[PDB]
Design a protein around this ligand. Structure first.
Ligand code: HEM
Length: 188
């Protein structure tokens, strides 16, 4: 995982569960509770999974529940660290932009494996978005969508069409319906 993001996660964990749970979880994996993660640092994914498992243990919450909660809250952390991506944006616009954003923010890393998040209109008031990644972070993905809905104050309906692994990649396809029309048919 890219260091910058793991950093936002540590902060989000502190905002949700407190400094004691977080400092202890970090120590459990050999980290200094106040460790400084550089932007381009490549934090091992399992190491992050071990931190979340420890948070799970200490909080009594299911680890998937924690990822879901971190995803909802991390949007707020994101708007504070990367305000430029939210500045005068609408939810549909924000989401359609994500696949490109993840590519741009990892292009400086050789062999980068960002999640693919291709989205496409499928109705005047709905889009289909497919999470594709080897990391299997379904709940984080679903939580970020829910958190995004809350940030932009735009109500949505999220239908999980399919989830599973195809050719080594975990995939989750959702259909996101908005309260109002957001698309119009136009000449291709
Ligand atoms: C403007 C806010 C956002 C920024 C700056 C951002 C940035 C990033 C970056 C740099 C990574 C690390 C990728 C890697 O190390 O390979 C990441 C991971 C991830 N992002 Fe975002 N992201 C944002 C919002 C979102 C949203 C809204 C979604 C979902 C629709 C999303 C889905 C994910 C997921 C699921 C991962 C976890 C890694 C994986 O599953 O492979 N992100 N994000």
């Amino acid at each position: 995982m890219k260091g910058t993001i793991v950093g936002t996660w540590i902060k989000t964990l502190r905002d949700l569960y407190g400094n004691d749970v977080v400092d202890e979880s970090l120590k459990s994996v050999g980290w200094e509770p106040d460790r400084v993660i550089t932007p381009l640092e490549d934090i091992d994914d399992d190491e992050v999974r071990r931190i979340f498992a420890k948070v799970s243990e200490k909080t009594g919450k299911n680890v998937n529940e924690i990822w879901r909660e971190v995803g909802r809250q991390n949007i707020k952390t994101f708007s504070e660290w990367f305000p430029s991506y939210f500045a005068g944006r609408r939810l549909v616009n924000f989401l359609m932009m994500m696949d490109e954003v993840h590519l741009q923010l990892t292009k400086m890393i050789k062999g980068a494996t960002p999640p693919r998040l291709i989205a496409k209109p499928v109705a005047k008031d709905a889009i289909e978005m497919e999470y594709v990644s080897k990391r299997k972070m379904y709940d984080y993905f679903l939580g970020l969508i829910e958190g995004s809905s809350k940030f932009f104050k735009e109500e949505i309906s999220v239908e999980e069409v399919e989830r599973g692994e195809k050719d080594g990649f975990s995939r989750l396809k959702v259909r996101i319906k908005f309260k109002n029309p957001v698309f119009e048919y136009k000449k291709n």
